[PDB]
Amino acid sequence: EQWYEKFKPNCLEQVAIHKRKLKDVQEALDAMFLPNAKHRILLLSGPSGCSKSTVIKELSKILVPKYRQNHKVTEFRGDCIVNDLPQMESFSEFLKGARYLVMSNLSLILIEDLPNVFHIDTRRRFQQLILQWLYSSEPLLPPLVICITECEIPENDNNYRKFGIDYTFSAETIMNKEILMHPRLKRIKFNPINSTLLKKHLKFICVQNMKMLKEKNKWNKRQEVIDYIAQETGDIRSAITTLQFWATSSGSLPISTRESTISYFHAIGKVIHGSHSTNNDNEMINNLFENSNNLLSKEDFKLGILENYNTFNKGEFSISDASSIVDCLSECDNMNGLPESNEYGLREVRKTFRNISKQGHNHGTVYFPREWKVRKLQNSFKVQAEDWLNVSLYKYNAVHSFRNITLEFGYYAPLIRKCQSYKDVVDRIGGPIEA
Amino acid sequence: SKENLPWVEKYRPETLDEVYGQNEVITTVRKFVDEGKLPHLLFYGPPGTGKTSTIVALAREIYGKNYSNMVLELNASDDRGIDVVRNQIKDFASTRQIFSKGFKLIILDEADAMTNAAQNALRRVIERYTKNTRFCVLANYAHKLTPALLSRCTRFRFQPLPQEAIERRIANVLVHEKLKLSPNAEKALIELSNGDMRRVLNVLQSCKATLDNPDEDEISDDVIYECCGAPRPSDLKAVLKSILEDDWGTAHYTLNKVRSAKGLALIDLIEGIVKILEDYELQNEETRVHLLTKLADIEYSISKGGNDQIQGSAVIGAIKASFENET
Amino acid sequence: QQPWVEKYRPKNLDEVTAQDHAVTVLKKTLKSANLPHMLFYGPPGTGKTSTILALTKELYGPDLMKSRILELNASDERGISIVREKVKNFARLTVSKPSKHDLENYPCPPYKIIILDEADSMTADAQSALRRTMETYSGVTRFCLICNYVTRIIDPLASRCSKFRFKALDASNAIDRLRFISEQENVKCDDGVLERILDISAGDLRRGITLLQSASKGAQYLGDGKNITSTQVEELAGVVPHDILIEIVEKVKSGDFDEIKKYVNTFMKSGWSAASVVNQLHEYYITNDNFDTNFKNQISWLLFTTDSRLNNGTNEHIQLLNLLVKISQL
Amino acid sequence: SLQLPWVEKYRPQVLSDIVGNKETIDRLQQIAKDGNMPHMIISGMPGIGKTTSVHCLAHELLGRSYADGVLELNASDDRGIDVVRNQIKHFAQKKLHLPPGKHKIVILDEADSMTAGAQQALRRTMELYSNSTRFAFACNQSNKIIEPLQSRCAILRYSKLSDEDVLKRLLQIIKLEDVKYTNDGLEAIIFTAEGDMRQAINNLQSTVAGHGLVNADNVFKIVDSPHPLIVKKMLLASNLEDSIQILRTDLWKKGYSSIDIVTTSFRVTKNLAQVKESVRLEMIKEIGLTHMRILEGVGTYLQLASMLAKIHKLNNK
Amino acid sequence: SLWVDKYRPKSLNALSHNEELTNFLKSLSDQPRDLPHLLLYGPNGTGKKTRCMALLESIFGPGVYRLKIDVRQFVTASNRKLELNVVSSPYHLEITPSDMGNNDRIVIQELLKEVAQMEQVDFQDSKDGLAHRYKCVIINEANSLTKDAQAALRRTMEKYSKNIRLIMVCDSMSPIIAPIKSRCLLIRCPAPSDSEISTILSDVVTNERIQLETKDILKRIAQASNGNLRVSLLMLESMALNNELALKSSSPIIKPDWIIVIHKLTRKIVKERSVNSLIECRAVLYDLLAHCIPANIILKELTFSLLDVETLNTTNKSSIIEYSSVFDERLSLGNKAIFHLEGFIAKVMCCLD
DNA sequence: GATTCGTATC
DNA sequence: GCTACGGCTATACGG
DNA sequence: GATACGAATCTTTTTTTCCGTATAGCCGTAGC
Numbered sequence A: 001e002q003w004y005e006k007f008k009p010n011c012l013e014q015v016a017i018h019k020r021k022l023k024d025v026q027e028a029l030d031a032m033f034l035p036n037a038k039h040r041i042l043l044l045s046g047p048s049g050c051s052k053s054t055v056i057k058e059l060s061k062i063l064v065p066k067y068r069q070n071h072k073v074t075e076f077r078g079d080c081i082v083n084d085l086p087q088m089e090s091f092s093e094f095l096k097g098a099r100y101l102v103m104s105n106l107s108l109i110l111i112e113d114l115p116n117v118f119h120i121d122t123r124r125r126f127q128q129l130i131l132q133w134l135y136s137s138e139p140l141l142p143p144l145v146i147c148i149t150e151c152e153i154p155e156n157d158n159n160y161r162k163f164g165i166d167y168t169f170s171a172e173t174i175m176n177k178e179i180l181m182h183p184r185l186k187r188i189k190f191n192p193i194n195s196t197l198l199k200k201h202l203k204f205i206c207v208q209n210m211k212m213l214k215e216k217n218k219w220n221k222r223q224e225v226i227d228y229i230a231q232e233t234g235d236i237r238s239a240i241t242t243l244q245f246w247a248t249s250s251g252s253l254p255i256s257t258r259e260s261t262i263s264y265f266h267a268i269g270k271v272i273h274g275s276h277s278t279n280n281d282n283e284m285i286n287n288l289f290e291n292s293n294n295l296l297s298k299e300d301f302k303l304g305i306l307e308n309y310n311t312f313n314k315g316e317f318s319i320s321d322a323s324s325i326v327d328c329l330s331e332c333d334n335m336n337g338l339p340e341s342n343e344y345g346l347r348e349v350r351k352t353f354r355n356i357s358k359q360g361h362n363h364g365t366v367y368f369p370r371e372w373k374v375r376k377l378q379n380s381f382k383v384q385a386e387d388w389l390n391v392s393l394y395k396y397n398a399v400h401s402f403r404n405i406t407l408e409f410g411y412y413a414p415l416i417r418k419c420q421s422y423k424d425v426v427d428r429i430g431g432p433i434e435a
Numbered sequence B: 001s002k003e004n005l006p007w008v009e010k011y012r013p014e015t016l017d018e019v020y021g022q023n024e025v026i027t028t029v030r031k032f033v034d035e036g037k038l039p040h041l042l043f044y045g046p047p048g049t050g051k052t053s054t055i056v057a058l059a060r061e062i063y064g065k066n067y068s069n070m071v072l073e074l075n076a077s078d079d080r081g082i083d084v085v086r087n088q089i090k091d092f093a094s095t096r097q098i099f100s101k102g103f104k105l106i107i108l109d110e111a112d113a114m115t116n117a118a119q120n121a122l123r124r125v126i127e128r129y130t131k132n133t134r135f136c137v138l139a140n141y142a143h144k145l146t147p148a149l150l151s152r153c154t155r156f157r158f159q160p161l162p163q164e165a166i167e168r169r170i171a172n173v174l175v176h177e178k179l180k181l182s183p184n185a186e187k188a189l190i191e192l193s194n195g196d197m198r199r200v201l202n203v204l205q206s207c208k209a210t211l212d213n214p215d216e217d218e219i220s221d222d223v224i225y226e227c228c229g230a231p232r233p234s235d236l237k238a239v240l241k242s243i244l245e246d247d248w249g250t251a252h253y254t255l256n257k258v259r260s261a262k263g264l265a266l267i268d269l270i271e272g273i274v275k276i277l278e279d280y281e282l283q284n285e286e287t288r289v290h291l292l293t294k295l296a297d298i299e300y301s302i303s304k305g306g307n308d309q310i311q312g313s314a315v316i317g318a319i320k321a322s323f324e325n326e327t
Numbered sequence C: 001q002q003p004w005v006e007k008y009r010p011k012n013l014d015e016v017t018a019q020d021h022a023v024t025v026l027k028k029t030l031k032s033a034n035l036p037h038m039l040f041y042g043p044p045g046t047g048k049t050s051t052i053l054a055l056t057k058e059l060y061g062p063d064l065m066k067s068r069i070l071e072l073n074a075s076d077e078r079g080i081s082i083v084r085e086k087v088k089n090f091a092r093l094t095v096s097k098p099s100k101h102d103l104e105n106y107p108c109p110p111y112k113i114i115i116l117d118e119a120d121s122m123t124a125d126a127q128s129a130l131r132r133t134m135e136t137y138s139g140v141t142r143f144c145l146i147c148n149y150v151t152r153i154i155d156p157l158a159s160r161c162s163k164f165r166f167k168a169l170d171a172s173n174a175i176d177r178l179r180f181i182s183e184q185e186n187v188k189c190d191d192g193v194l195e196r197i198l199d200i201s202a203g204d205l206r207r208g209i210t211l212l213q214s215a216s217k218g219a220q221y222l223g224d225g226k227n228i229t230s231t232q233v234e235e236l237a238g239v240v241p242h243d244i245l246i247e248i249v250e251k252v253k254s255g256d257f258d259e260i261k262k263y264v265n266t267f268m269k270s271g272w273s274a275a276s277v278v279n280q281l282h283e284y285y286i287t288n289d290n291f292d293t294n295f296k297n298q299i300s301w302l303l304f305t306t307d308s309r310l311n312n313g314t315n316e317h318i319q320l321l322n323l324l325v326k327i328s329q330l
Numbered sequence D: 001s002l003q004l005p006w007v008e009k010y011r012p013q014v015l016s017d018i019v020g021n022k023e024t025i026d027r028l029q030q031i032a033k034d035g036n037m038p039h040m041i042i043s044g045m046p047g048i049g050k051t052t053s054v055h056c057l058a059h060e061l062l063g064r065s066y067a068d069g070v071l072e073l074n075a076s077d078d079r080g081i082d083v084v085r086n087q088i089k090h091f092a093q094k095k096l097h098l099p100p101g102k103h104k105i106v107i108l109d110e111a112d113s114m115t116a117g118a119q120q121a122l123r124r125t126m127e128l129y130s131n132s133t134r135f136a137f138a139c140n141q142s143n144k145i146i147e148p149l150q151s152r153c154a155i156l157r158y159s160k161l162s163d164e165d166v167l168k169r170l171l172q173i174i175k176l177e178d179v180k181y182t183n184d185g186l187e188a189i190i191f192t193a194e195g196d197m198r199q200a201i202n203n204l205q206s207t208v209a210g211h212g213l214v215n216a217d218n219v220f221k222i223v224d225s226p227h228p229l230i231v232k233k234m235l236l237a238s239n240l241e242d243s244i245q246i247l248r249t250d251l252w253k254k255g256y257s258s259i260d261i262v263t264t265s266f267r268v269t270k271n272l273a274q275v276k277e278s279v280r281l282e283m284i285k286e287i288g289l290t291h292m293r294i295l296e297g298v299g300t301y302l303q304l305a306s307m308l309a310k311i312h313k314l315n316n317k
Numbered sequence E: 001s002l003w004v005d006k007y008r009p010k011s012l013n014a015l016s017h018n019e020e021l022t023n024f025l026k027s028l029s030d031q032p033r034d035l036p037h038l039l040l041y042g043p044n045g046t047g048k049k050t051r052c053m054a055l056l057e058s059i060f061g062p063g064v065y066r067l068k069i070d071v072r073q074f075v076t077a078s079n080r081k082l083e084l085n086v087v088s089s090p091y092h093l094e095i096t097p098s099d100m101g102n103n104d105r106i107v108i109q110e111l112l113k114e115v116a117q118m119e120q121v122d123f124q125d126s127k128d129g130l131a132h133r134y135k136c137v138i139i140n141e142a143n144s145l146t147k148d149a150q151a152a153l154r155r156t157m158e159k160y161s162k163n164i165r166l167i168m169v170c171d172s173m174s175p176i177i178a179p180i181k182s183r184c185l186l187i188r189c190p191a192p193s194d195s196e197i198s199t200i201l202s203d204v205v206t207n208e209r210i211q212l213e214t215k216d217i218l219k220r221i222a223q224a225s226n227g228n229l230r231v232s233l234l235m236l237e238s239m240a241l242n243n244e245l246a247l248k249s250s251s252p253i254i255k256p257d258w259i260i261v262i263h264k265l266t267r268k269i270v271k272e273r274s275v276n277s278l279i280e281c282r283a284v285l286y287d288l289l290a291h292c293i294p295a296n297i298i299l300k301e302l303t304f305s306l307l308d309v310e311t312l313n314t315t316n317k318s319s320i321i322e323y324s325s326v327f328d329e330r331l332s333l334g335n336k337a338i339f340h341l342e343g344f345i346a347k348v349m350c351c352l353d
Numbered sequence F: 001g002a003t004t005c006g007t008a009t010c
Numbered sequence G: 001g002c003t004a005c006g007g008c009t010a011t012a013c014g015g
Numbered sequence H: 001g002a003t004a005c006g007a008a009t010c011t012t013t014t015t016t017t018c019c020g021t022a023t024a025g026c027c028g029t030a031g032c
Ligand SMILES: Nc1ncnc2c1ncn2[C@@H]1O[C@H](COP(=O)(O)OP(=O)(O)OP(O)(O)=S)[C@@H](O)[C@H]1O
Pocket: A003, A004, A005, A007, A008, A009, A014, A015, A016, A017, A047, A048, A049, A050, A051, A052, A053, A054, A055, A112, A147, A149, A201, A236, A237, A240, D147, D148, D149, D151
């Protein structure tokens, strides 16, 4: 078969996972098999090929035949289309029959093949069906494990209606905050496989192919290809597939693995401090725009640059550089989201931070923009102002525009009503102003 | 019926021999038809160059009287989304040609307005049914076409119409309409054409309407300038001389008098002064940089409106300040 | 009865003044039947809408107008679907049979007219979906595009449409039309008036007619039987009085930032429009003989920049203060 | 009237006729002779032989079983979540008696245009049925295929075709068709091709049809030099009076639209060498302002002349 | 009610702050049949809306102040319930399309076109009438129309001028396009002088006894109001109730909290000029923007507070005003205001250092 | 990509 | 022989 | 014992097409 299917781990010691991560998964899973467990769903999130299900299966192999009140998992198959069932009801009938997999029929239900969540209605049905499992009144329920692979959704659906699920396939955009911040849900984020474990497993696979490796005069150059694959990728499946493709080859075809997408804070750090791989800013910016145009085009990135450019040296650079950066960002904001705007703003920020960059600079920590907090406080201000307006319409027949409200009605009007009451709203609209 | 038509539609070419200006493209497509092997074509050029007139005449030459059932013409006036490509174009290409003229022709006019999903889906319809159907893509902007679609199409560029072709078509129009045109009027029409036959025909129709008697009267340059509302070649030179030589009061008076003489706008004067200053032997390399940059901002501000007198004074001051560098 | 701008709207093509290069061409199409696709562009209030409304009437008559005319403006949706369905189906429609009265009184051309007024507000895709609609059905349907900015019309559509530029209506070509309206309404004005009205209304007859109507509504309210003077016209047009402008230029000549800032602060309270005081300063500074070539060259660009910033919808106080400070340091 | 265009008439039918990317074609030949084809993703610029390689590999791997062992789906066919869940699932579930080491092949041409839900269902499709059928994705930009799908595949990147492979294929076609040529004409055809076989064949066909003899004059009078190479020459000029001359003569009077020149200038500047980053970002800013002015309605020659003047001003300073 | 609405002139003869304007309004209302479309422009709080209502009361008689709120519902291209309050009277309508955002085009294209299409025939009356024949629509804040609602009005108020008339209230009529201003009669409303504001406040403190110690305290409020009658009448009530209805010469003038915060920001900018100070200024700007205060006013007050600093030379102020103009133009042609509001501050501190 | 805390190993 | 109503199916619409 | 390595944290508020469900119209069949 394929080397990632024939050289699959047989026990937990052969799984490419960190020791601490394995310990936290093991203890959490063991706790979820108790009669009345505090955690009902275990949400495993991370990149592709991180042994997320490759650890769940081999842990179930030793966990399920320990608590079965006298051996494997029950995985949801989304592609199953039965005769008399709506497509959106396929997961409901799976969760309604999976809840019977309890004592004397115990089985860890694993949901790796998620239902179609790019369609809004079935995504909402999935969310409310998970909420109906977290808030279930059943005295005993089987352990539920949901594996979600964090992958960036590529540029498609040219409509401007791109939602979060249209940008990144992550647990945040599939689940809601009620599920994600539930007392009975445990989240264990997974990290890409480190170079040491990848090297060890690719060397075990090589000593299991030593005969064929030596016959094709490829056994002394195995160290360099394992090192290159370990340094280039963090995907175990992609690493083994590339190793198999290189071994079964008989030529000088170059080693090429899959491509990974950077993070939002990773891209911010690349724009600010530069990349260690290349000292050419033009090449780095061009590759960042080529591979990650879905993130460099969103306005929140240009906002994050303005929010985090002060972390270069904890805020101890020249004011002229900061003025140039913010002026360039303001000028880019007037280009109506053209491709030439981001490619100029990021280039100017990188050029500004390159010249002032000196050795020994103790940089700061970047953060996400607070624009959303301001936008929600604006909506709260709107709600309170409309409450002021409608409560000030029948008691005292008067119409006033919201622009006049945000200037003189919210400081003066409470200062009159509360002063008339110190002897009908009486508080400042939108809360007090600070600093 | 055809005499109650606008001149831009009445004088549409019906055969490939009536398409002027584009000699290399026509002498290639005619041999392509003569050999009988027509590849997938791409016609590119400015508006009013003769791309649609070429492709319709070519299809008429190939198909004769069977143009109705053998040619599918889809343009921007019809929906051409992913479903349209996957159904209408695909069933037109897949079905047989009733053994009429060998291969089918699909003309995609104004394909630059087509969405990228449709242009990407059309790539495996162009190269799969190429034995029975051929695609012709007409576009004015090549940046809106996917690179693969450009790759699977033979690109023919329609150049702006040369002066000789404009003169040859004007002669036919004058013969048909029994009109007389002075050589200076023809020169004015060709310089204002900017390589467009539609503009030539539209201006000629208005010039014929302007004449009190369509016959026994010749359309002079004055008639053309009055009809199209363009400054005369002397007014532009007078304004430029007043700006470059006279003081700030006399130049301001001369510009306003020239503009109020015939209700001349500022944008055409700006373009004329730009064209006249283009062939000027500047010797500082900053006079040109300042002139072009200031006149472009004035031209952009005029496009959004504003105070006209302030813009005219801005033009005068920009020219005067840019020519301060030269001396 | 009605506002004078609507009462004196041109009913026929002979009432459209100062635009003969286009009306002469349009009148010839009454005898012929070769009306082309038309693009009416020019300054606001020049008579583009009135000309097409008069041409439509003179071509069809009030009875055939309802069947042979489709008018779409910015007051209705003109998206890609509207252009590809409603306009295309109206162009594909068959020319209705003229009545015997219509054929015996009106020319009744064998085509209909689609009038797309305020075409500058249409998107580039709705305009792209119109090119083959006008070309294919040109023998049965004609198109009239009316706009103020010809740059907002795409080049493919502008090539297919005959361009008719409507000239700005100044005191040299609209004085007879204004005098006619003054005479029919029995408006008494001093000599020089009805020219100051057309000078204040830069290339706009609608604003001048409204200004004259407003002057008359005060003249017959005063009830003294006296002629309207240019001072009242300037007062009710928003023109800054010359004493205030002289004070502005005297404060500018001193060059002290604080006094100019205080004067601008007390001037913005009077409610004067920035585009008017900037325009008046332009006339004061450009035509004056006490300034050198360099000063005029610099201030021309300063006024151009100020006007361009003001046209974008910016704060008048900041722009006016910056302009006066820049002139004070020239 | 029944003669096929030279692009389709001389489309390779075996892997040995595919010039360029010698190592990758050799590896495809090893896959064809052995049989154990892995899941693969083929990416590259259009017209370098990505599709004609996958199809030839499927032919040489199946032969008489190609009719029932290959399911070819592309952008012209509907490839929603339902087709993947029904048609692809039934094709994968189908049991066909193929020789040893031979597997069914699902050729998903233009996989970069597939929706996200179909790509996510393809994960389960390849996971359940990897022992019987193998998937061969062919695309132009490999990042459009989701990372979970790329993890199960062996990425094969096709590079640009050099000037020697193009000449070899052109000479084979010339010998087959017996056309008259000279060396400079073929050099001009390769130069205008810019690493494109399909465009080189189309240009050679057009030149032969138009004139018959493939020389530089007849090639260049029907085919045009690549306008990115003229935009690069205009933007890299030393003094303004010849950059304006280039923009006028080779771009404006030739018929290229102003928006096309502006869009090409941006891509040229992004890849321009020997220019400082501070210069490059200012050039990008000026090109973006010019692009805004063109998009807002002012598509005139003066706006391009001003952009070149600003670029020269920033260059000299 | 508040003293701003209680002591509001409800007739054209009760206006007492501009007399050359009241006479022009009387001239307009003498023959209301041929009343053109009116555009009242001037500083905020001068009494433009009060004068519009007084003119409507002179035209259609009393009862135009009998306002009721009729909640409307609109649907845009993608189905979404967008709500607009319509304050209506038996003779006039008041709409604020800016309250619904960028989608005011649909409000102008549906509500205004439906109102302008109804002839208001009533009982017979097919010939003409001074009242109840044509209708008055008041568009408050005409400046915030997004250049597309102003395009749908050009033909709406021109073709249907017989059955509808428009009186739009606005300040600083720069963002109003030229075709809209061409169809309308421009009415300038100057701000009251300090003497007139003092007289109005004297009438208010005469009708309601606040025990004025000196007439100077009313003048100080007028000078602090900067021409705003509503603000002056609000501070009068504030210093009245906050001093147990007894105004003293030592009574502090109460100013809006955001103005005090802008002054504190100005002093911080003058004192500290560094990157961390710029980050603190960004926090202050974000807090100010969280209270739905428009960004153009933030920039205007920040600039005119920085120009009041006595420790700044003329070269610094001439650069501050230039940066203010540049960033105001950038803010007008922009999407997010924080970039420009931070760039202006950064350039100001980079110039003052 | 940066900082900070915590291991594992040579 | 005829009719009404439930089940099957094609189509416009929501998000 | 020095150090490389690794994990945690640094995050969220007009237009087109597609996927599954809703719904009314037409045919089949029980029956009175
Ligand atoms: N030593 C190893 N450790 C982990 N996985 C291994 C190992 N050797 C082979 N594999 C295979 O690598 C694959 C890893 O699968 P997982 O990472 O558990 O799935 P995943 O994380 O959901 O990836 P995606 O998102 O489905 S592509 C499985 O097919 C394993 O059989």
